[PDB]
Structure formats: C-alpha cells, structure tokens
UniProtKB/TrEMBL annotation, chain B:
Amino-acid positions noted as binding dTDP 1 in the UniProt annotation, renumbered to this chain: N223, S248, A249, F293, V294, L296, S314
Family, per entry: Belongs to the glycosyltransferase 28 family.
Coiled coil: none
GO molecular function per UniProt: hexosyltransferase activity; nucleotide binding; UDP-glycosyltransferase activity
Domain Erythromycin biosynthesis protein CIII-like C-terminal as annotated: residue spans: 258-401
BP term (GO), one: antibiotic biosynthetic process
Annotated binding of dTDP 2, by residue: N223, S248, F293, V294, L296
Keywords: Antibiotic biosynthesis, Glycosyltransferase, Nucleotide-binding, Transferase
Short name of any one Pfam family annotated for the protein: EryCIII-like_N
Record-annotated Erythromycin biosynthesis protein CIII-like N-terminal domain positions: 24-246
Protein name from the UniProt record: Glycosyltransferase
Entry binding sites for UDP: K13, N223, V247, S248, F293, V294, L296
Length: 416, 407
C-alpha cells in the first residue's frame, strides 16, 4: 500500500529530467512523491508537476569547472581491471570524491538527512552520483535504489576498485568512498555498507544490450523522453522537405564545452552549406556568437526534442542522456562529437559499435568530419536500421507503469 | 499498443489540474499525451510536466452568477418542466459552453486531424473535445471533477424531450454541436454530450447515479506547481484552520471580516489569499499566517478544517486528507452540491454565502473542531477514496475501452 517516496538528485536539470517519468509513474499509483535537491533546482522541479523540496545550499562546481575536463583521472570510460593498477583506480576514486561527489552532495546531505527524518520516506530513489540519497535513506531505514541515465561506469569502476582492494594487505587498504560516506553515516550512528555506493537495486533506463553487465539487482525500465517544459509550435506541423538535422548544445554542458575545439558557429556554417533542414537548439550565449544565420537553419532556445525528433534524420549532441534517449526512442541516428567525461564517450561508442551512429573525439572535429559523418548517417541506410533495432529494444522494455509493482515489492523486501 | 492521447480542457487552471494525474498515468505507461487549451493556459500546462498544444484564441468569458437559470444544483424531473430544462440548456450553451469552446473548437479539430489521436479525454464542459474526437474517429471520455449535474440535467432534458410532439422538439446542444460536426461531414450523437464513457474522480457514494459507462478513479491531489516550505515542519499546537478564496472571489461577507473572526479563536489559521485581498487587511491577527502560494496537499495533513467555495482542488485535497470542510458558497457549477454532499454525509457543513456572518463562521468552525462526528465522517470518505483504483490501475481499462470504441 501507500508509500512516501523521496527522489534525490544533484542540482542538474539534465539529471532531474531523466527521473520525471518514473516519479510520475509512482505518483500515478497513489504514492506521495517528493523531489529533493539544492535550491537552484527548485524552479526546474516545479515545472515537472512534481513537488519540490529545496535542501541545503548551492555549491561551486560550475566555477571550479570553468576555472579549470577530460584528463586521465576523470576518464571512467574504460573501467577494466586490465587498465587499472590499485593506485590508478584508488586515485580515480580519491579525485572523483574530492572534486565532483563532495561538491555536488555535501552542500545538502545533512539537510536531506533531516528531511528524511521528518518525512520518513519508505523509499529513496537517487540519481547515480547523488550519494546524499542513500545516506539519508540508510539513516531512516528506507529502501533505496539508483535510477540510471548512465552506462554504468560508476558501479563497474567500483567493481574494479573492490577487486584491487581485496589484493592489498590490511594496513594498505583505503577507501575514499567509505571514509567520506561512512564518516557522515557514523555521525548519525550508522555503518557504511557497499549498498550506499550502488543502491539496494538499480533501476536502469539503458537498454540491456548497451549496458555493462554487473553483479547488481537490476530492474530494466523503458526510457520515456522528458526534456523539460514543452509546447508544440505551429511550424512543427509541416513534415520535412529534405533530411532534417538537429543540433543541441544539450540541456546543460553548453557552458563547459572547453571552448578549445571546433566552435558552434563553424558547425552551423558547415551544416548551412548542406542540402538539409537544420534545427539548432542554442543558448542565448552561443546565439550572440553568429554573424549570419544560414538559409537552411532555424534557431530555437527551447524546443520539445521529443516532438522535434520524429522524422528527423540525424541528431548531433555531446552524449547527454536526454538527447541520446530521445533520439533512441525515435530511431534517429546520432552523431556524437564528445569527450571522455562522465559516460558521454560510452554513449557515443556504444552506438558506434552497434552501427546505429557515429562518435568522434571533440578535438578531432572539423568541417570535413562533420559534413562527412552527417552525409554517411543520411545516405547509408545501415545506420537507420541499427537505430531501429535499438528503438525496438527500448520498446520491449517494461514501462515505468509496469515496474511500479516491482519497486513496491523490492521496497517491502529491503526497507523497514 | 502505443496510443496518442489528446487531453482537452477549457482555459481554467482549476480544471486543468484535475486532469494531470490521469494524463501522467497514461504517459507513464508509454503513451504520448498532449494537452490542448487556449493559449492563455499554455504556461500552466507546461508547469505540469505535460506537453502543451495551444489552440485557437483567448475568450471574453471574464468580461449575475447565481440565478435560477444557472442553478443546476437540483437536476430532477420534479423540478423541471420541459420549458424550464430547455431554457437551462439554451442559456448554458449560449453563455458558458460556446464562450469556453467556440474560440478553439476549429483549431482543435485541425490539430486532431493532423495528430490523429486514438483517444481524447475531455474536461466535462469542454465539448470541443468530443467534436474533435468524433471528426477523426477517436475514442473519447469525460474526466470528471464534478458531481455530475451535467449528465443528470441532460437525462432530465431527454425525458422531457421524449414527451413533446415532433414539432415541439428542440435541442440547443444538438443544434450547436451538430452544426459544427455537420460542417466536417459528421453526425451529432448523444455520446458527444456525455462521452463514450465517463472517468469519474468523485467517490461513488457522493455521485449522482446515471446511465453511463462509468470508470471510477481515485482523486490524487494536484494543486499546480508546489514546494514544501521550512515552516511546515512544525506540526500544529492547536486546531489548524485553512482558508482559500480558491482561484475566484463580492456582495456577501468580506475576506477581512472572516480573517478577523478566525483571528479571535483558539486556532492556527493559514489563509491563501490573492494580491489585492492581502492589501485589503488592516491588521493580520497573531494566530494567522498569510500566503500567496501554499501546496494545499502538504498543508492539509493534520489540519482540522478547510474553508473554501467548493472548487474540486480544495474539496478533493481535503477529502483525501480526511479534513472536515466548511463551504460557504453559491449555486454555481457543482459548488453547492460539493457542499451539500458533505453536509448530508455529516463530514462537513455548507451554508449559502449570503447567510455567512461572523457568528455562523465561528459556530461552524467550532462544531467541525469539537464534534468528532465530522472528522469520523470525513475519515470514512477518505477511506472510500483510498479504496478507489488509482489512475495507474485504470490505465488498462482505458486502453481496452479505446480499442472497443475507437477506430
């Protein structure tokens, strides 16, 4: 019967939007669903229809990032024993905890624990780098599960870490994740456990065929596009004269694209010279950039990506899940010029190896590569066919609706 | 299989919010759900997480409320001659339904032709909805926020129509909607008035019995964009009394007089009030907190009384929280029925707005706080709601009915 369910996410709109269909599935089954994050994300939560719970204070991650992306210690794209000594994987955990996880989470973890103590959720569903979530859950005995937008490099890197940890003598064992999260749990009289790192189970929006196999309790769920507040405009109605090519700087990540590789304006100009229709979703920032707007190019601040991608031929993006997933469910071939940050590279590579799209490193992106890649995805039918196979795989996955009872049972099993 | 589902509502946020949980239930099952209304409501739709489709132009309804011809509170044969019920349909079509719908009906038909929804779910006075559905052969159903005075008055109307000689037959609803349908080459049918089926958020025990295909569904509060504030955490020292003007709100007792009465009582008061009635007050009593926004669903747990005009958001949210209601209201829409249904059940109190005095306000609140029979009856209705299938549970029913009745 009736549950209180707390969603927890770091203050990224892009992360939040991946959680909205599952949150609404649970609300639609009669459960109370509250979404907690830093105050900066309150307005975004409120536009999802879901109840927002602002917790703690805003953090400095964006200043830290812009003032300094892809270096070997931030590269979790190849989480394999073969490529990690103990000290390499330990160092990755040390730096990811210090720079990313603590910045994202420490600003709100105590306030989240407080809210959980007051509200007493039966279940906490957490974005996979929102480790404040399982801490708060554990303190109040709630069941808790990750909800994945990601190729699961996090749990896979953890597996590598634990294999190497087991090879060390007792005195040389160190775990930055256990120190950090165990420290916080200790202050509330609770123990650390490995389930705070990977959840009691994992609800996974990545199609099984493209996901890394792991020793987890895994609940596959269908990705349903939610790209933030949307309306269908009048101009959308007229189905497309020639191949439609869509380009997003993303939903975040706009303002951390290095600057140091091929500019937005150069990409627009390349696409401007092609026999296609271009729709470019660009932020006021990079909109000021451009001298001309090509004849074949329409520019938008907001577009409902899910409404735009039906019938489109190509989506060009940095590997964010909103874009990746929405193109996937529409069977649209993807071109992903990106970096080894988060799982973006894996998002590109997974499609590339399946023959459903193309990945290239952002640093290697030229007008010639852009043009040739788009041409190939338009002309070579093998791309659409492979994309269509992935579309069908998504379509066979149980919906949020279908997994509601599974989540209910798992909560009963693992919670208070 | 995967459906395109078009929600249609008149441009009232209060109506829209009643539809949001069912819309999201269907979206969560993998269906595409678009919500169409006049452009003024696009911002509200977008804050629900649902995809908005602006259609047509904004209307002049805003630019006399309780009078006998607008009173559908007692839709009974016994109280309606043919000419009385005919006149009610003539005036409701001319003044309310056409104003709400004619500004967007053609644009909605156009959108339906383009998008080809399998199913249209319509707010019960959004007759543009079933017109658009019928034109494209879609299944369609009403989603009710209301004690169903609309379908009940229609039943009275049809009983009296059948008593008339052929020459004296007249149907303002058929003329209006049949006229529009005719221009697109389609027939009028009675199902455009009551839907192919009715999805009903009113607990069965409080709803008027009708000859309809009826799918009960649990009301889940959605009161628009909400956040939980810090001050809510401190559970209540004494009876909490909540007062909403609603989304409306003046020749009867003013808001300022109500606040002053409640200000003198041994209670905590939370008053959700709009800009100009906030300026209205000289003092704010010590026991009174004033808010522009409060998430009613978060506010009403542990509250003792909700005072409101009979809007469904308030009514339903108090109902699911087991909170006794005091409804000083008028015979507009189903507001009076919302009050009287609770009154007869012993779960709250209704009074006509014109009879509201400081003495009646004080005494009614005291009774709902002190007499435990009110909380107990409210709690029974809470439990009745809780036994109703959720939007989640009725998704398959809606799928099957769409297959049965649609293309």
């Amino acid at each position: 019967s009736h549950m209180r369910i707390l969603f927890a996410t770091v203050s990224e709109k892009s992360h939040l939007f991946t959680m909205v269909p599952l949150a609404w599935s649970l609300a639609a089954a009669g459960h109370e669903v509250h979404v907690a994050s830093n105050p900066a994300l309150t307005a975004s939560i409120k536009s999802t229809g879901l109840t927002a719970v602002p917790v703690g204070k805003d953090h400095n991650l964006h200043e830290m990032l812009t003032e300094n992306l892809e270096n070997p210690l931030s590269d979790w794209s190849t989480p394999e024993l073969d490529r990690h000594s103990w000290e390499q994987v330990l160092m990755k955990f040390k730096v990811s905890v210090m720079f990313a996880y603590q910045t994202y989470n420490d600003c709100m973890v105590h306030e989240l624990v407080d809210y959980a103590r007051h509200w007493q959720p039966d279940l906490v569903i957490w974005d996979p780098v929102t480790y404040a979530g399982p801490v708060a859950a554990r303190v109040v005995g709630a069941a808790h599960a990750r909800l994945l937008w990601c190729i699961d490099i996090y749990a896979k890197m953890r597996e590598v870490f634990l294999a190497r940890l087991a090879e060390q003598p007792e005195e040389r064992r160190e775990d930055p994740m256990a120190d950090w999260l165990g420290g916080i749990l200790g202050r509330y009289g609770h123990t650390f456990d490995e389930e705070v790192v990977v959840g009691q189970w994992t609800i996974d929006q990545i199609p099984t065929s493209l996901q890394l196999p792991l020793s987890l309790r895994r609940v596959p769920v269908r990705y349903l596009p939610h790209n933030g507040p949307s309306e269908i405009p009048d101009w959308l109605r007229e189905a497309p004269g020639r191949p439609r090519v869509v380009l997003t700087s993303g939903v975040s990540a706009r303002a951390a694209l290095g600057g140091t590789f091929m500019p937005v304006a150069d990409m627009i100009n390349t696409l401007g010279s092609m026999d296609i229709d271009v729709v470019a979703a660009l932020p006021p920032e990079e909109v000021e950039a451009l001298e001309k707007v090509p004849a074949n190019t329409r520019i938008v601040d907001f577009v409902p990506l899910h409404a735009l991608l039906p019938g489109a031929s190509v989506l060009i993006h940095h590997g964010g899940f909103g874009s990746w997933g929405t193109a996937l469910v529409n069977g649209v071939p993807q071109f992903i010029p990106t970096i080894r940050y988060a799982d973006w590279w894996n998002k590109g590579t997974s499609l590339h190896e399946a023959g459903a799209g193309l990945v290239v490193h952002a640093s290697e992106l030229t007008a010639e590569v852009l043009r040739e890649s788009v041409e190939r995805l338009v002309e070579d039918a093998s791309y659409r066919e492979a994309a269509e196979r992935l579309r069908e795989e998504n379509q066979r996955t149980p919906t949020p609706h279908d997994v509601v009872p599974v989540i209910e049972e798992l909560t009963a099993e693992h919670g208070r």
